[PDB]
Amino acid sequence: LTVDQRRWEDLKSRLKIAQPLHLPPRPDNDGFRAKMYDITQHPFFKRT
């Protein structure tokens, strides 16, 4: 086989294993939960 078909087989074997994310959505029980879940998805504090 050529290199593009080898790359396609690599794409097949990569999507063979991988699974989607299971991250929970935004909880609206109080303002503290929302304002902590808003701030922790910031690329500055993650860099800190």
How far is it, in rounded angstroms, from Cα 14 to Cα 10? Answer: 6
Q: Are the C-beta atoms of 32 and 25 separated by less than 8 Å?
A: no
In which element (H, E) is residue 43 found?
Answer: helix 43-47
How far is it, in rounded angstroms, from Cα 7 to Cα 25? Answer: 35
How far apart, in Å, do the first and last CA atoms of the chain sit? 47
In which element (H, E) is residue 39 found?
Answer: helix 31-39
Determination technique for this entry: cryo-EM
Amino acid at 11: L
How far is it, in rounded angstroms, from Cα 25 to Cα 2? Answer: 44
How far is it, in rounded angstroms, from Cα 21 to Cα 34? Answer: 20
Query: Which residue is associated with the tokens 């074997």?
Result: 13
Cβ atoms < 10 Å from Cβ of 47: 6
